[PDB]
Design a protein around this nucleic acid. Sequence first.
DNA 1: GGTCTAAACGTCGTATAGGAGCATTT
DNA 2: CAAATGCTCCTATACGACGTTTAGAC
Length: 291
Amino acid sequence: NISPWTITGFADAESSFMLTVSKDSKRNTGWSVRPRFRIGLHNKDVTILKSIREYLGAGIITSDIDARIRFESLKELEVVINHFDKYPLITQKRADYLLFKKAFYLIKNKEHLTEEGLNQILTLKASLNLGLSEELKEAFPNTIPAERLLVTGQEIPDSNWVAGFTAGDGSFYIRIAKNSTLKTGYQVQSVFQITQDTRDIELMKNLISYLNCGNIRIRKHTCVDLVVTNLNDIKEKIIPFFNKNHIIGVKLQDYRDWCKVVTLIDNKEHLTSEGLEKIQKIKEGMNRGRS
DNA sequence: GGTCTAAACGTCGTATAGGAGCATTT
DNA sequence: CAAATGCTCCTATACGACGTTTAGAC
Ligand SMILES: [Ca+2]
Ligand SMILES: [Ca+2]
Ligand SMILES: [Ca+2]
Ligand SMILES: [Ca+2]
């Protein structure tokens, strides 16, 4: 059974809080307003959604071109709010969450069915994710966006948060570099990685302190990566950590193979031709190459 | 100076995030 | 008949993941 912090960590990675405001002649305000919480994944990781569903006792799961769990009814959203209030997000999504939560409150008390309250919802939507479309701006032209919590000073709340977070955005891959200065002609490196928009670089920096290893990389996305390449950071920090705090989803299979390769590297078989072929074959069966 | 590790640097493709609204039930 | 919510379809970017070169440790 999945840990609650794993869910929050995973949601920090993969979830979305949304407000849809659509024109509807049949409603008294002329508008339909609704809050949503959703996670969407590749079909192959539907099992993650089911584990989440069994835990919260709520949510509607669908599978078509992708896999989704959604919370749209007030009862379902209440479950969502109770959880994240209890196990709070620590990425910038907390600010999206807080906007979302205010809208939810407005709707529960039926203030969205009035014009003033309707107007209030849009200021929240205006500051939520991608904000108001031009069209929504036109219909509600003088909307001033609600205050957004700038999220700062967040401590890693729990080891299972990291596991959930890494299961969404994290990566375990084996890096092979063509390099004539090596006998085999290639360097082999086991790599652990977390990718995130630079808006949360502080958090990534916090994750490095928390795991006591890794470097910060700013690319040429505008995304930042946490990267661990040090062999005995991997051996003595990363692998023991994720052994206790389990990766979920297909990536768990990737982790295990990744773990296996670290052993091979640790025994220097990568510095031999035969071992390198071994490693390549495993690598070819990991991540995107996994069928 | 020869191997090797660490990590700085490079970069593509899509699974994520985020979105909007009609249909059906209450 | 209006409010809730079940259901479905659209967009694209923040991711994941793969490759090379450089600093330097030994
Ligand atoms: Ca993410
Ligand atoms: Ca993911
Ligand atoms: Ca992700
Ligand atoms: Ca992708």
